[PDB]
Curated annotation (Swiss-Prot), chain A:
Inner capsid protein that self-assembles to form an icosahedral capsid with a T=2 symmetry, which consists of 120 copies of VP2, with channels at each of its five-fold vertices. This capsid constitutes the innermost concentric layer of the viral mature particle. This is Inner capsid protein VP1. The chain holds residues 693 to 790 of 1333 of the full protein. It comes from Bombyx mori cytoplasmic polyhedrosis virus (BmCPV). It is found in: Virion. It comes from the Viruses.
């Protein structure tokens, strides 16, 4: 039932959003077996070492931890403009 | 060097009481807008109504 | 005498409004059966055919 909303609508929002200005990193090559993020540091002979990507664990921001359970409402309690009967 | 393209089952199978492949139905489907399952269900509900 | 033009239409008396059909345009047209999603209002009209 919801598959058209995903493929034939939300896909375009992803395709746009990937071209947004500040979405600068390459997040995923589509190959789970091989892909690793490019890793960079600001680094100085004087001894600075500031990795851009780093693992500090749960933060105040609330972005670090992922509840996967979110997939359920998305499948079983969301409406979409494509489903359904016409909505601009 | 290739062309990715859709291939309808009617363009593979042609059993008389299984897969309707009348050129009438063929062209009639050719007239149809792209369809989700909700669209089809809306059609059935309308005809029933 | 003076009949300017004689067409062969689908019979309205048989394909009544009770069928949902409207033949005034010279083609059958049924509102809200097959209908495209994801389009501007009034883009639904051709599907009525």
């Amino acid at each position: 039932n919801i598959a058209v909303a995903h493929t034939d609508h939300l896909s375009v929002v992803y395709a746009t959003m990937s071209n947004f200005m500040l979405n600068f990193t390459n997040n995923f090559s589509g190959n789970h077996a091989t892909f690793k993020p490019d890793q960079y540091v600001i680094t100085s002979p004087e001894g600075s070492y500031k990795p851009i990507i780093e693992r500090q664990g749960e933060t105040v921001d609330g972005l670090t931890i992922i509840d996967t359970s979110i997939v359920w409402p998305i499948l079983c309690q969301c409406t979409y403009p494509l489903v359904r009967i016409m909505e601009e | 060097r290739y062309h990715e393209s859709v291939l309808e089952i009617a363009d593979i199978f042609d059993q008389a009481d299984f897969i309707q492949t009348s050129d009438a139905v063929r062209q009639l489907r050719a007239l149809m807008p792209t369809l989700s399952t909700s669209q089809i269900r809306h059609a059935i509900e309308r005809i029933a109504q | 005498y003076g009949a300017a033009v004689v067409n062969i239409d689908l019979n309205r008396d048989f394909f009544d409004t009770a069928t949902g059909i409207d033949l005034t345009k010279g083609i059958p047209l049924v509102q809200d059966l097959l209908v495209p999603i994801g389009v501007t209002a009034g883009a639904e009209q051709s599907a009525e055919y």
